[PDB]
């Protein structure tokens, strides 16, 4: 591809932003899902409001232009939602604009054409009636999987953006279920939760990276995906999260050896809701949320500005995989403690998902 280099960093710089604010919760989101959502939204913005968004995603408009970025995002977004694509990954965008605006046509047009997104006008006057239409709009277009999302709306809201994404993959080489069994997972030096622990002795592209001071495991997905797990040495969690860099993962990936290992990957299902305004705000993206907001590409009547931007992602990890099938002690590698992981898109290498698991039970 050609944006992986930047989304990769966006992914990271986005991560150390949500992690900074609560090193006690699980963290899970799709860097691509979001960039896509703002790259999409950028379509209806102009001037600085516009350039500030694409830059905020680590793009340098003077060394590459939009009419190529949008090109790249769409090439990737296809890969995922594609036809044969049985990777089981759903994702979309909701756009709620205050009813009473002659919204430019072309916009809605492009939006629901390339960036898989739908627009719905609502009555922001009634703080509760909008809350209602929305929570319900979402619960309908989400197949009833996301309920009562928006807990509480604002008062002067006039534009709201909801971005979602569910994912549950099957591995190339699956785990027998008769083998998984409950085990201790040390979330803290004091707390300990019991959790189902999938286990399998196999040939892995696992290796103990000294630079990151942590075991790094690679697990291929059935499809155009790949998951990389990082198990950090005692108290090296913080370090790991600090020394991570695209150039490093990139190298790891390149290598092609493989050695015996006894894996203890935990069976888990986690999600993560986040309010982007604040975070992206820290990452440079402000105008679209401020007052000047140049959203002329969306409406030409009154002023307008993104008031709320929410992101919900859901992941499920299990033993599922392709239906099918005393001489050198292999290293035991048990993920029974906080660990960081990242999902890559096989073709483009872009960062599909990113997270930390601090408690397999927490929600």
Residue numbers in the entry: 24 to 348, 357 to 394
Can you provide the manuscript's text about this entry?
The plasma protein α1-antitrypsin is principally synthesised by hepatocytes and protects lung tissue from degradation by inhibiting neutrophil elastase. It is the archetypal member of the serpin (serine protease inhibitor) superfamily of proteins. In common with other inhibitory serpins, the native fold of α1-antitrypsin is metastable and this property is utilised in the characteristic serpin mechanism of action.
The structure of Gly117Phe α1-antitrypsin was solved to 3.2 Å resolution, allowing confident interpretation of the secondary structure of the protein. The asymmetric unit contained three molecules with minimal intermolecular contacts and in an arrangement not suggestive of biologically significant multimerisation. Electron density was not seen for residues 349–356 (copy A), 348–356 (copy B) and 348–358 (copy C) of the hypermobile reactive site loop. Before incorporation of the Phe mutation into the model or any restrained refinement had been performed, clear density was apparent at the mutation site, indicating that its side chain was oriented away from β-sheet A towards the F helix where significant changes were seen. In the refined structure, the F-helix is displaced downwards (towards the bottom of s3A) by half a turn relative to its position in the structure of native wild-type α1-antitrypsin (2.7–3.5 Å between equivalent Cα atoms). Conversely, repacking of helix F–β-sheet A interface residues, in particular Tyr160, is necessary to avoid steric clashes with the adjacent Phe117 side chain and sustain favourable hydrophobic interactions. In the refined structure of Gly117Phe α1-antitrypsin, Phe117 forms the centre of a cluster of aromatic side chains, interacting with Phe119, Phe143 and Tyr187 (all at distances of 3.5–5.5 Å). The side chain of Tyr160 is in a solvent-exposed position in this mutant in contrast to its buried position within the helix F–β-sheet A interface in wild-type α1-antitrypsin but remains well placed for aromatic interactions with two residues of this cluster, Phe119 and Phe143. The increased biochemical stability conferred by the Gly117Phe mutation on the native fold of α1-antitrypsin is therefore related to increased stabilisation of the F helix. However, stabilisation of the upper turns of the F helix and/or its downward displacement as seen in the structure of Gly117Phe α1-antitrypsin will reduce the propensity for its remodelling.
